[PDB]
Amino acid sequence: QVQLQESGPGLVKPSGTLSLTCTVSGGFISSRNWWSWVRQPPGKGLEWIGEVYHTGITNYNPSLKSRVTISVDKSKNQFSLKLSSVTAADTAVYYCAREVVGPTTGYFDLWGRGTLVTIVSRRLPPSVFPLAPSGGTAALGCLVKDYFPEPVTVSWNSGALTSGVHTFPAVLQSSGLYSLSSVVTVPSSSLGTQTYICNVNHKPSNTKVDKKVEP
Amino acid sequence: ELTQPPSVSVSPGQTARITCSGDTLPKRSGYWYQQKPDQAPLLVINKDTERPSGIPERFSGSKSGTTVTLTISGVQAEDEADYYCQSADSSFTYPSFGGGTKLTVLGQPKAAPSVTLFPPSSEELQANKATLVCLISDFYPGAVTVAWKADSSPVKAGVETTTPSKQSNNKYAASSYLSLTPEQWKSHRSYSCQVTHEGSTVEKTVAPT
Numbered sequence A: 001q002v003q004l005q006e007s008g009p010g011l012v013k014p015s016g017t018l019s020l021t022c023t024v025s026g027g028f029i030s031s032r033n034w035w036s037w038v039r040q041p042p043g044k045g046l047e048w049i050g051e052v053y054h055t056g057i058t059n060y061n062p063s064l065k066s067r068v069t070i071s072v073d074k075s076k077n078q079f080s081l082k083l084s085s086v087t088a089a090d091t092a093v094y095y096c097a098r099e100v101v102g103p104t105t106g107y108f109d110l111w112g113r114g115t116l117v118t119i120v121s122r123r124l125p126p127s128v129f130p131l132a133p134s135g136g137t138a139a140l141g142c143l144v145k146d147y148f149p150e151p152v153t154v155s156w157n158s159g160a161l162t163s164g165v166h167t168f169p170a171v172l173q174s175s176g177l178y179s180l181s182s183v184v185t186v187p188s189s190s191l192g193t194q195t196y197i198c199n200v201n202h203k204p205s206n207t208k209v210d211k212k213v214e215p
Numbered sequence B: 001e002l003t004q005p006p007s008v009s010v011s012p013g014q015t016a017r018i019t020c021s022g023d024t025l026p027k028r029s030g031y032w033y034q035q036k037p038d039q040a041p042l043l044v045i046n047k048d049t050e051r052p053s054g055i056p057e058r059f060s061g062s063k064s065g066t067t068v069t070l071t072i073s074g075v076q077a078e079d080e081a082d083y084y085c086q087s088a089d090s091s092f093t094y095p096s097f098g099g100g101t102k103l104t105v106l107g108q109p110k111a112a113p114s115v116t117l118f119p120p121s122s123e124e125l126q127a128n129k130a131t132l133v134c135l136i137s138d139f140y141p142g143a144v145t146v147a148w149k150a151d152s153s154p155v156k157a158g159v160e161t162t163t164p165s166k167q168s169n170n171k172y173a174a175s176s177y178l179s180l181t182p183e184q185w186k187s188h189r190s191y192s193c194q195v196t197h198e199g200s201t202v203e204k205t206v207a208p209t
């Protein structure tokens, strides 16, 4: 089966150019299908950007048409998107997708996983504070305080610790800044001897911290 | 333009109907996608009425001229998702999408919240700041009230609380943050987070080390 995978920078400066590439595997760019980009701002609906045929013929959303370039590269089996003069309205998850196009109708039959691209203007790096943790179970965590914009990712022990992890939705404070907490529930018995590290990454401000959480 | 309702809610086992209306549907047909959080859309109904082979039999589609309908019989909790209808414009130049319909599945069992309360970290206090963090999880329905106390007196200023949000296991989570000066923190004997849910309260207390 054909698979699609987006790649490219997740952060763009205002007025800069968003650049993404879709690697097609399992099948050829050359085919009866058209190739396309669709985006979805967080919490909003789907918006089609445009489509390209393997020969290079393009067709774009007329509300974007002045800023969009879609290209195909059969030697690498890829098709690409450039979106110029970006603003905050371009922050979105970008999907590549395969279209089935007949003489009178079309639809989408295959989608990439989607990649978030954020247009970063103002930004603020968070502080990361440990939330230190008897019998029973124990809660410990990390507070990621006062960052902008979203998002932050949190993992624990480099992704090795998954069970019992709950990273809470961020709060938007009256300050206009975000905070969030990530908590893991562990056996009280593992505390004396298991090391717990929360891996925080706020890419808009290049804040990448691995914070040890100790009693 | 395609028009679909922003929300539909159904009880488990009932039949959900989501309509999509637009003048292009007769010639350009309608296609339905299901989309769950952090996932790409998935085609569930092709060309008005066709069900793709991997899609459960309870999904079906119908057409009624300038309306098309997605019907889910015997709705399950797993069907809660956004649903998009899609067509094309009258000149067959571009796709059109509806705004999406959130399907909510009602009738989950009530569940009382768990509450964890953390004091300020030593690192924060050294930065001349103090935050108490009250984390509230695994409750249903998705309404809670949080009250903070300094000793036993109510604290109102410096409070930030999220609106409850649905977790992966279909129960809700919320969090509440109390900002203090380190002088406030050390002066009182303790602070407490009181979480009220459907008339029952759970309280947690913390104190300076």
Ligand SMILES: CCC(=O)N(c1ccccc1)C1CCN(CCc2ccccc2)CC1
Binding pocket: A034, A051, A057, A058, A059, A099, A101, A105, A106, A107, A108, B087, B088, B092, B093, B094, B095, B096
């Ligand atoms: C003779 C030219 C022609 O036929 N076209 C065209 C027009 C302008 C510029 C390049 C090509 C078509 C326009 C429509 N797209 C499909 C739109 C779509 C996609 C996904 C779901 C629904 C609809 C296919 C190519």
